């Protein structure tokens, strides 16, 4: 019976329409735990500066 | 393997899974275990290549 591993683990992502303006920042970011310095993604759909 | 294809065929008899129409390995790497299974059938993992 095929067994398998995966990427999730060591990728994943979310998302955030906006609303009510303000929301200056986010918190958590993603729901739990750290998230890491080193590589950023921060996307407007354009995918934000460094 | 890859290149020139792999046929595994489990004719007729107890399908290897499902259909049973022949199974063919276009993997480059590959390993097979399928055994005789008892509702008649050959389970054969994943394409395990290594």
Redesign the interface.
Request: glycine share 0%; charged share 55%; aromatic share 12%.
């Given at each position: 019976?095929?067994?398998?591993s995966s990427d999730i683990s060591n990728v994943a992502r979310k998302e955030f329409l906006v609303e009510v303006q303000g929301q200056t920042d986010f918190l958590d970011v993603f729901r739990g735990t750290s998230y890491n310095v080193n590589n950023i993604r921060v996307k407007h759909r354009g995918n934000e500066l460094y | 393997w890859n290149v020139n294809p792999v046929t595994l065929v489990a004719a007729s008899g107890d399908t290897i899974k499902g259909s049973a129409v022949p199974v063919e390995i276009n993997v480059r790497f590959s390993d097979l275990e399928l055994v005789y299974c008892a509702p008649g059938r050959w389970?054969?993992?994943?394409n395990?290549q290594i």
């Open positions: 019976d095929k067994i398998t | 389970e054969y993992v994943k395990k």
